[PDB]
Structures are given as C-alpha cells and as structure tokens.
Amino acid sequence: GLFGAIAGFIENGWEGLIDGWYGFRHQNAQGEGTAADYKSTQSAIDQITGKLNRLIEKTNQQFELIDNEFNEVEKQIGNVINWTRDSITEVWSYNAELLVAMENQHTIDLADSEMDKLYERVKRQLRENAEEDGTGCFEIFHKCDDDCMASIRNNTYDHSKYREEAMQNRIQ
Amino acid sequence: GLFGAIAGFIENGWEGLIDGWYGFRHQNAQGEGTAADYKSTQSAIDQITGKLNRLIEKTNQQFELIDNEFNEVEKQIGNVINWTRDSITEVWSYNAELLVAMENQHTIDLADSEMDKLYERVKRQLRENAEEDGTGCFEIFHKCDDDCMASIRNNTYDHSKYREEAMQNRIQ
Amino acid sequence: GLFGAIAGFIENGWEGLIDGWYGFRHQNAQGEGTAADYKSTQSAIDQITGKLNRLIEKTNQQFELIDNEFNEVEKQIGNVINWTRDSITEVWSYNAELLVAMENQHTIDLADSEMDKLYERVKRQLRENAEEDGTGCFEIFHKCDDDCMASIRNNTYDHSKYREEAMQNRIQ
Amino acid sequence: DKICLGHHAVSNGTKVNTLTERGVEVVNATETVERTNIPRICSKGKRTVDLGQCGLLGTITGPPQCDQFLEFSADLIIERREGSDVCYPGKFVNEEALRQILRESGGIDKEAMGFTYSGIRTNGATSSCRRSGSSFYAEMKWLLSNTDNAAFPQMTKSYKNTRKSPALIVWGIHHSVSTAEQTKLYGSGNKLVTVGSSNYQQSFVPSPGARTQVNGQSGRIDFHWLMLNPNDTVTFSFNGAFIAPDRASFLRGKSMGIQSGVQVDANCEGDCYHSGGTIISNLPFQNIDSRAVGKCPRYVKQRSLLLATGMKNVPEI
Amino acid sequence: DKICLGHHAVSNGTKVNTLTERGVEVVNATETVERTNIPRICSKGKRTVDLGQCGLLGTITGPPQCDQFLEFSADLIIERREGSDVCYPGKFVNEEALRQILRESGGIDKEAMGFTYSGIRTNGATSSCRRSGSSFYAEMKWLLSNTDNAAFPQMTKSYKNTRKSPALIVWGIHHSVSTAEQTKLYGSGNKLVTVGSSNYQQSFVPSPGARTQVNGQSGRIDFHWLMLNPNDTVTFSFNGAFIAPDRASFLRGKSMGIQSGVQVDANCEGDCYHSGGTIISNLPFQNIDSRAVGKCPRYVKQRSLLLATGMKNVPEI
Amino acid sequence: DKICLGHHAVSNGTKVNTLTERGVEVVNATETVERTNIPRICSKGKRTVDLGQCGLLGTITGPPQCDQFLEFSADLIIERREGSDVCYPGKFVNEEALRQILRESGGIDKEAMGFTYSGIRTNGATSSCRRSGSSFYAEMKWLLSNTDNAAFPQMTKSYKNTRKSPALIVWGIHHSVSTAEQTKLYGSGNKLVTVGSSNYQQSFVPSPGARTQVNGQSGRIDFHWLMLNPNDTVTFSFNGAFIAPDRASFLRGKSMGIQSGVQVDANCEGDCYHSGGTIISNLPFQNIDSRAVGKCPRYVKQRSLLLATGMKNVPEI
C-alpha cells in the first residue's frame, strides 16, 4: 500500500469480519466484541464499483469484414490488412494490460487509504483520552464499557466526559 | 479524496475565501478573521498548470488525404481505409477518455493532499500548545491575539513562548 | 511529492547516506551517528524494480515488410501504408510519453510515501516520550545513549522504560 | 482497555497484477477478457438471410441455387462455405469489393432493364445450370448469332437509371473453348464489348482456349459490374461473346454480412459475430477471434487480465 | 480560542468524470475536445492555388479551364467540386494515385519533350475544348492520319529525362465511336500503342464503340501516366488512336492538397483543414471531422471531455 | 537530545518528466528508447540466405546470377540492392505480392512439370543470359516456331499439382521489338495465351514494339504467376510468344525476409532488423527506424524518455 495500513502497521486482516470491509474490534471488561463500519465500507465499495461501471463498457462502433476466410483476398491487400489488424492488436493488448495494472495499483491504494482515514477519524475522536499502541489499537486510559465503545463506533464519543479521569490515568 | 481532507474531515469549503485555494480562519478575542495561504495555493496551482501545459499539446505530424470526397476511391481500398481510420478513432477516443479520467482523479487527489500537508504543517508548528478538534481546527489552549494568529499563518509561531501556560491550561 | 516528505517537511536529502535510501541520524551525548533503514529502502527498491521488470518488456509479435525500399510499391497502396504506419507511430509515441510521465509521478510519490511511513512508525514507536520538532526529528525528552538509539533503529525501543522520566521531563 | 481498527481477509484470495508487483493477492477480482463463445449465430430480432448454397454474388446473376434469393431483404446476411456464385464456370472481377457492397446492402431489389433484341437468339442454355432441363442465369441472357456460324450484328443497348440510388449492373463475357466454338456461337472476327457511362470506361474481348474442366465445362464466363449513378445511362456496344443483363439491382438499405459454419439461433441476441459463433459479453476485451465483426469487445492477445475488485488480502497468520 | 484550516468553494462548480465517479463537481474545469470550426480556408502566409474549375489532373493535360494553371506553384492546393479534369470526355487510369502525387508536388514545371512528326497531321481539335474556336488539350497533340482514311505509319518517339528528378509523362488513347470512325481518323487495322522505360512495360489498343454522350461526345480518351526516373528514356511505339504528350511535368517541391467548398481567408492562419474549413485549436482532440488533414488535434468520437483544473467543490451548506 | 529521519541525495541527479512537471531531478533514471544500432545483420543460429546479386523473383525463373539459389532453404532471406530478377529485360505482374510470398516461404523446392512438346523448337536463347555462351532462364523454355517464319500450332499443356501444398506457377510473354520479329519467331496472326485453373481466369496477347534498350535488348518478357491449389490443374492454351515453365515451385516452410546493405554477422543474435542493421535491445521503444521488421521495440518519434528509478533528488544546501 501507499498509505501504510492495509499491509502496513496493521498487517493482519480479520477473516472473522464477514459483514464489512472495515471494523472495530475492542475488549473492555465485558469481554471482546467485533463490529463493521458501514460508512468506510460503503465508500470503498462505491469507488470500486465506479471503476467497474466505467470499464464494463460497450463500444457502439460497428466494424465490418474487410477480408474473407472462404476465398482469400489478393495477397498484397491481404498483407496490408493483416499488418494493420496485428498493429491494432498490439495497441489494444498494451492498453488492456496497462489499464488493468494501473487500476489495480490504485484500487489497492484507495482501500489502504480508506483504512487510514477511518483510523485517523477515531484518533481525532478520542482526543487526549487515548494513546496509539502502534498496531491499529487505541489504548484507552479510562473505563470504556460496551456503551462507550459503541459511542466510539457510531461517532458520538464525547472526549470531555472522561478527559480529567483519562488524563490523570495517563500521567501518574 | 485519497487523503481524507477536501471532502473528508473538513467537508466544507468556504465560498468566502476568494483570494486563495487554502486559508486560515480563526477567532480569538478581537473577533474572527480569514486569510489565504499563498504557498500551498501556489503549489496546487503550479502542479495543475503543469498538467495543462502537458496536455494542451500540438502534434507536429502532418497527415495527408488518402481518399476523396468528390470522387469516391475504389471500393476495396476505400473499405480498408475506412476500417483503418475507424480503428484509430476507437484507439484515440479510448485514450482521450482514459487520459481525462485518470488526470481528474489525480488532480482532485493532489488538491486534497495539499490541504492535508498544510494542516499537518500547522499541527507540527503548534507542538504541545494545541489540540485537534477533528473538523480542521486547532483548539489553542492559551491566549492568541491577532499577532499570534499571524505568527501561525506566516510560519513564525514559537511554541516555547506559550508552552508552560498552554500545557497548564490543558491539563488542569 | 504527494505525501509531503521527500521534498516537504524534511526538504533536505543527505548526500552522506550512501548505504540506503532512508536513514536515522541522531545526536545524543556520545556525539552524532548516521545509519540506514534496510526495510524501507528495500520496499522502495523492490517496488521500483517491479516497475522496471514490467516495462523492459519484449513483445513476441513479428511484423513483416509490407513495402520496399529498393523498388517503390505502387503509389496508392504505398500512401495508405505510409498513412497507417504514421498513425500507429502517433499512437505509440503518445503511449510511451504518457506511460513514462505517469510512472515517474507515481515513482516519486511512492518514494515520498515510504519516507512518511517510516517516520510515522518511529513516532508511534516512541509513544509519549518524544515530541515532533517539525523537520523530521523527534526531540526525545529523556537520556537516550547509543544503545537506546539503536533500539529505536532496530525496532525494539520500549516506551514504558522511560515513560515516567520522559513525561516528567516534558511537562515540568 | 483497548479498541482496534482493522480490515477483512479471506483464506482464498485472487492474485492480480499491478504496476509494481506480479501476483499480489486481493480479496476479490473479476475478469476483463472474454473467453466464452456461443457456438451459434444469435439472430433474435434480426431479419436474417442464410445463403446456404447460394453464393452472395449469385444473388445478382441467378444460378439455380440462388433462385430463392434474387430479391432478398435482410439485416444480417450469412455466407456459407458450401455457397457458390456460379453454375456455368466463371468468376467476377473485383469480386470482393462487390461482396462488401452486398453484405451491407440490406438486400437487393431487381428491376427490368428493358433490353430488346433483333437479329439474334437470346436463349443460350447449358447443363451446368439445370432448372429441370438445361437453363442459364435467371437474371441474364446468353446472346447468340441467330444460327450456327452466322454474323453477330454489332448492336448497342442502353439503360438509364431513372431511380434515386445507384444501379448495380452486371454483364458477362463468354470465353469459348476455342475460336472454332466462338465462331459457331457468334461468328468470326475479334469480338469487342464496350461499356461506358458518365464515370466509367472499359472494354473487353473474348479469350477462347481450353481450360480446366469445371462443372463439366472448359469454357468460362467473366462477370463484370459497375454502379450507375441516378439519372446516368449505361451503354453496351457489343458484337458477340456477351452475357447480357436482363435486370439491374438496387440496394434496399443497410445490413451486416458474416461468414459462419454454425447454426442460426433465434433464442439468443448478439451484436458480435465470428465464423464460430456469437460473442455475447459486456467485458471490454476478448481473446476469441481477432476477425470478429459487428459491435465487439476489443481483441487482445492475452487470455486473462484480472481486475481487482477488493483490497489487498493479508491473511490471518 | 481556535484556528481553522479550510479550502475554497463556489456556488457554481463544473461536473467532470474520474476513474471512480461520473459527474464529480470541481471548482474549475476546461475543455479538451475542439468543437468550433472556422468556415474558411485560413491561408495567411501560404502560397495558395485555388483550382476552382480546373481539375487537378487537368493541370497536366491542359483543358481550357486549366490554362492559367499549367505551371502552378503552391504550398496549399485547393480542389473544388466544380473542377473538371477533362474537356473531351475521358478519364485517367490510377487517377487518385496521380491526384496524391500532385497534391504534395508544390506545383509543376513544364518542359517540351521535343517530339517531331512526319507523314501525319498533328492538329486534331474538338468543340468540347473551346478556346475561341474548337481546340484541344494545351499540353497534348491529337495525331491523325494525314487525310481521311489514310494509313498511320507505325512511328516511334523517345524522350530522355535529362533532369535530376523524375518526369511525369502522360499520353492518351482515343476510343472512337466506331471502327468506321477509327478508320477515318487513323486507317484500318488493330492499332497498338507500346510504352516502355527501364522500369515500365505496358500496351494499349483502342476500343471503338458507342458510349453515353458526355460534353456532346460519344468517344472517349483514356489518359495514362508514368514517372521517368532521371537519365532514363521513355519510348512510344504507336500506329494510331494516340494522344501524344507535348510537354512533360516536373515537380517543384512539396505542398499539401485539400478539398473544400469554403472561401480562402488570408486573415487567419491554420494548419488543420477539412472540406468545411479550418480547425484552429491548441486542444489535443477534435470532434469536427475525422478526415481533417494537415497538423490536427486527434479526432475522437466524444463531443466533450472536461479536464478538471481545480479541486473538488464541496459547497457551503 | 534528538533523532532525525531523512532520505538520500546526490550532487549529480537526472532530470525526468512527470505529469505535473518537466525536468524534475531524481536520484537515478534509465532510458526507455533504444538509440543504438548494430550495423550488421545478426544471424547467429539462423539459416541465412544472402541473395546478393540474385533478385528474389529470379529464384523462380533462374537468370544466371540465381543459379546457386534455385532451391534455397532459409529462415532469414536477405535482399540486396545489387540484386536483379532478370537477365533478358522484363518484369513480373504483382511483383511485390510475390516478393512477400517468397520472403516468408522458408525457401523453395522445384519440381518438373513434365511439359513435352511437338512441332516447335524449345531452345530459345539470348546474350543477355550468358552461361558461357548465350542461354536463357534455367527454369523456363523459350518456345519458337520450328524454323524462321513458320506457324506456331495452337497447343495446350496441363500440369496437375499432385502435392499437398500449393504450387507456384510462372510463365512469360515475349514482346518482340516488332510484328516483323514476332512473325520470324512465332509466325503471323494475333497470338493468344489462355491460362485457367479451378479459381483462375486470365488471358494475354503480345505487344510487339520498340522499347528502351535494357541489357542490350529492346524486347521484353512479361512474367506472370499463380498458385495451384493441391489436386487442382493448370491449363495453358497458347500459340506463340510464350515463355513456358519447366518446373514449378513449392514452399518449404516459413521464414522472414529483410532488405539490407550491411554484412552478415554470425557472432551476434537479433530478432529486430532494418536496412542498416540489427536492433538488439530489451527496451520497449526505439527511435532508429520505423520500418524495422521482426520482433522489435515499438517505434516512437522521441529520441529519449527517461524513466525515474529513484526518488526525487533534493540536494544538500
């Protein structure tokens, strides 16, 4: 990846996560839990299907026969025709390989990017009440029961609520 | 965007900002003020006009007539010619659509990126004396009169100046 | 760059660094020292040689002669041939220029990106015991003899070790 | 406490290529190159003429196997390997140019040219064109001298195209097996056919001589053709060895012609054809046949180009 | 306190396409596809020859409407629909190959070939080529038998190209209305024109016969041509029905030829031309005419491809 | 204390182009466009035939300079500027189509066609084809009337291709300097050569007349050719001015033909050739010759396209 996530400082996917591309996995005190993030998941899904709609493209140009597989056309015009068709086959084969390699590079990178965006959104959401452990997890230095984790997930965590408690639990 | 800014955690443009692409908007105690950042603005402007200079390109290849719209050339050579011209029209139409779609994707992304770079520069500039509110604004936990804001803008803010005051105003 | 590093908030290369693309330069108390990072260096090297292996490509299509430089073919078929060869030369010249410009833009950007990734890895590695000076350096607010710097380099620095000392040296 | 961000993976990813790596594993992918043929001519909704044993140029001249095709009407014209343009041996000059005209013609509509004759016969026949007995080309007339060895009086005939599109005109030259036989058919002397219009100029003499027996015949008929522009006249000055047109052809509209050896199928719809069938596909590329005609994915050399439709697959270790 | 980072927006953005989305709104954009024509032939600074009623091949043979063009000199040659190559009816073999030679010739320069004649006439004329009275092709000679019905003595003439570039040579064959008339012009017998050089080999016989009246004439003149290499000789063995060259043509340099029905304009400059005018543009693509000639943007099928020149427009809600 | 991250630089970077900037300095770069020629024909490991003075079409007819080439076998055929297809002056119809057939033939293998003759001579010779004395084309026969001025009895000959690939057949027409000389060689009358097969139809008459002396000859030989399909027969009805085939050619396999003026070199290997040598390269593009043949980098107009292989070079200030 270009953004250092989907094979970077996370470097592990979750085969368990079967209802989204991206998810929160937390463990507090009531045990561990795992959920999807439909927002980011939908952003990557929509960008990629945008690519798909673009390339599954139907040309409207009709081409007709210019030679004949039952009665060979004259040799000189047939060699010009064959040389032309082969030159255009070269062009389109190059175009198709390059198109797919470029597109794949950018697909992987925008998936990576959506991960980095989500992570950064939660980091900014948690303000001074958490630390970056370096593997994709926020060490949260205050009690965060299931409800509090769901407030992180659904984008309603209020850092002011635990700011004093958490800062005190971080420093001394 | 690929960098999560120009339609990401900012997600609003300023129609007021009419003298640059990117700007600082602050409110301290003397009221609110809005200015442009010519450095980033010029970087995006120069990259994009670089694209423009590249594509507004004048080919030097002369092509001549090979058929005749007043006296139709012979049918077999005319069908080969038409089939060739149409194949090259297909190639160039694909090239032009792909070129413009790729370029547009990358233009939007480098604009997004210039935003992220500017934001990060100010974050690093403010050191320990500020917090990230999560919408593009730095909550500055010390007095920052107009002069201090201009020191942020013009890249001369000295974090050591307010470091004690601000840290104390952040913790307790 | 797209990621704001290799000509961004670092904006200087080290001509001294002659054994890697990316490196740590530190000064503690035993003087200053400079080392390479083989991990990132190898990642950029491998991606770029991947590009090279792709483009140093040998087509397997044979083309034959369709005209004659000793005895000119007939004028009308020769003009069709010349017009076709010139059209394909136009196509391939455009393809080659675009391919190289795109690829160069992305090479520079993935080099830039590898820098940003490495920097971020060390930032996350140092946790609460360091600050970002804004030019590529981590001001480390605790004693870090040569061994400690090598623990940063070789990815074994334990932030818990100096966490109390360093935090105390940062606040008051 | 803790909360972790992450992405998904699978035990079963698909390798793809990128600009920098070959064989990167991604969560999901999809094919851009059509490999799958339908071995039929998908003709659903299209006026289709399967020429079978009638060769396409025979629709203009009318050998017996083309009797049900003399005025066909089509959007899709299909040529078959078993087709023949002739009954009495012969061939057309600029035959393939004419095949391409007739493939996109939408069919032909015939019109009497109103040639009337004088001191000659008009009923030349042969056993190579059997309709019950010996016959000829339905659209043509084998003109002879009135009786064995007699003079062919140097005639002229004209036809004016009084229609608003161009007239396809076809005639023939009979190359007898010998100048003895040419004399028995048309009398002696070097016989000369002149044909002119407002943009056309050509002339023809017979070439008697012994040839490979074809259809049990050592003689041959040259067929030639031209396009009369609207309101123009065609003129035939001739003195023998002349196979004259009885009707001219007009083109009906537009169509497409293919060559194939697979069956018509009105249960499927397709716009991309080749000799072995129909390429139904929405993919941008195909690796089935570079000579596919119609509206087609572009032909490419590679059999497969997988397009990533998911993120990089980094498996749970 | 506070300080915020942000970017600009507008109430009036332009939609563009990207790889992932269709119709993304961006701050500013610009067109890559030229739609705008100039309905004139922009010839500022170019030596321009507008052939008008003279057809391009007539500049070599010299029908009256080409009298002011027999030695033209140009960088830009313009052909007009009203042009005609002929006065007495006829046409050229490989006419379009010759048109392409003359379009890029930079013009022609004529030179006497120095044929001198013996027991024949040389002043054949017609009312189809009027210069005051009846006349002929200025660069050619209508050779007859010396008096009605007399023999044409089988002559030979040679011309050596003593110049350092190739000589355009043109001759004609006269197809009389009949072998009676061919006899009155050149005497009886099958008449044969032989033409040879160091790389050329061909032969021609007349084809008398009745044709469509064109310009009030039922006879026709075939015109043929070849390129004499420097220091090579061309040889004409002939016995009648021969329209002989009086002068040969040499090419002046290089030019471009177009076909158009719009007026010359010396107030504008342009390198990209089509029948309807001049494509002045710096854009890389055009959707005006796929047969545009010169130095042109590439023709594409789409009428518009907007290139983003600003960031994504996210409007103030 | 402190620890800093950084990247490398050099005093000596290479400028490249990107989508947004022209002349960005990067640490390292590499060329994508091949400029370097090898001025030899790199033939290591390839069966190579250098035709030298034998012209490629002469391998079928057999003028003296082609005597060591009448049955050549090759993967790489090289044509030379000094080559000539003829000894007695003449040329082939559709010569370049035939050159392209023979370039990819892998060579030719000859077979007696078994024509036997009656009341004629068969040993026509000339001083333009010297093998010691006056001779002819090794693969052909100059057929005459049995003695000066006598009749040529209208003969027929047939050859059946009893092989599983098509037979190259070649014949000639002799155009005498005059109808006097044509009469001394073959007797009087318009002489007619008819040639037919199951898909072929054509005829030929001689064209006596005076031509440019070439090789000390004013007469010319037309050469013509056709491809006999397996199990088909070719038929020659003729009465004079006929240069008859003695042997037919069969194609050996496949090859490539080039035109060059540089020497063979068996020390280097190459698949991309042009008149000036061998383009050995792995680069995707070349700017040496747009008519390069074989397996080649694509020809492009630019002389250089530097591909960045390092990061942006930002020098130590």
Ligand SMILES: CC(=O)N[C@@H]1[C@@H](O)[C@H](O[C@@H]2O[C@H](CO[C@]3(C(=O)O)C[C@H](O)[C@@H](NC(C)=O)[C@H]([C@H](O)[C@H](O)CO)O3)[C@H](O)[C@H](O)[C@H]2O)[C@@H](CO)O[C@H]1O
């Ligand atoms: C002009 C003529 O009558 N010539 C005689 C040959 O026809 C004949 O050769 C035999 O021909 C047989 C079939 O020939 C027909 C046919 O059915 O094609 C009879 C047709 O009525 C006749 N048509 C016309 C308009 O004249 C036609 C024609 O003559 C030729 O096709 C023209 O070349 O011939 C069959 O092929 C036999 O196998 C063949 O021997 C010979 C006698 O052998 O005498 C010729 O004078």
Ligand SMILES: CC(=O)N[C@@H]1[C@@H](O)[C@H](O[C@@H]2O[C@H](CO[C@]3(C(=O)O)C[C@H](O)[C@@H](NC(C)=O)[C@H]([C@H](O)[C@H](O)CO)O3)[C@H](O)[C@H](O)[C@H]2O)[C@@H](CO)O[C@H]1O
């Ligand atoms: C050879 C000859 O004289 N033939 C007679 C026909 O010319 C003539 O037909 C009439 O021709 C009229 C105009 O013909 C000219 C002309 O102006 O073109 C007179 C020219 O001097 C003559 N030129 C030469 C070199 O011979 C020219 C020429 O004969 C023909 O063009 C060659 O085909 O003809 C006009 O077209 C009349 O409408 C037409 O009737 C007829 C008499 O009707 O007698 C022919 O013997």
Ligand SMILES: CC(=O)N[C@@H]1[C@@H](O)[C@H](O[C@@H]2O[C@H](CO[C@]3(C(=O)O)C[C@H](O)[C@@H](NC(C)=O)[C@H]([C@H](O)[C@H](O)CO)O3)[C@H](O)[C@H](O)[C@H]2O)[C@@H](CO)O[C@H]1O
């Ligand atoms: C048919 C004939 O004999 N014609 C006489 C001319 O040959 C002769 O012209 C002279 O020809 C000289 C060389 O001619 C040969 C040759 O070596 O090519 C002699 C060959 O045996 C003969 N071959 C055959 C099969 O007939 C050949 C042939 O006639 C011509 O090439 C056919 O066009 O000619 C040499 O070129 C002299 O320079 C030339 O004068 C003239 C006498 O001048 O008389 C003709 O009757």
Ligand SMILES: *[C@@H]1O[C@H](CO)[C@@H](O)[C@H](O)[C@H]1NC(C)=O
């Ligand atoms: C052109 O290519 C076809 C196959 O694509 C081949 O069968 C045909 O013979 C070729 N024409 C030539 C070699 O003249």
Ligand SMILES: *[C@@H]1O[C@H](CO)[C@@H](O)[C@H](O)[C@H]1NC(C)=O
């Ligand atoms: C080739 O295309 C032109 C229009 O681009 C058309 O008018 C012409 O008739 C075509 N030639 C054919 C169909 O032979």
Ligand SMILES: *[C@@H]1O[C@H](CO)[C@@H](O)[C@H](O)[C@H]1NC(C)=O
């Ligand atoms: C085609 O181009 C070659 C050079 O590429 C030139 O020498 C030749 O004369 C051209 N053919 C023409 C102008 O008919």
Ligand SMILES: *[C@@H]1O[C@H](CO)[C@@H](O)[C@H](O)[C@H]1NC(C)=O
């Ligand atoms: C993989 O991609 C294709 C095309 O987008 C889609 O039809 C298929 O359902 C996808 N599979 C999964 C598991 O997403």
Ligand SMILES: *[C@@H]1O[C@H](CO)[C@@H](O)[C@H](O)[C@H]1NC(C)=O
């Ligand atoms: C939009 O882009 C075009 C081309 O770059 C430029 O000429 C025009 O002035 C631009 N408009 C604005 C408002 O920037």
Ligand SMILES: *[C@@H]1O[C@H](CO)[C@@H](O)[C@H](O)[C@H]1NC(C)=O
């Ligand atoms: C620069 O790149 C080329 C091609 O990758 C390589 O052969 C060469 O050794 C490189 N030079 C350096 C100093 O890396």
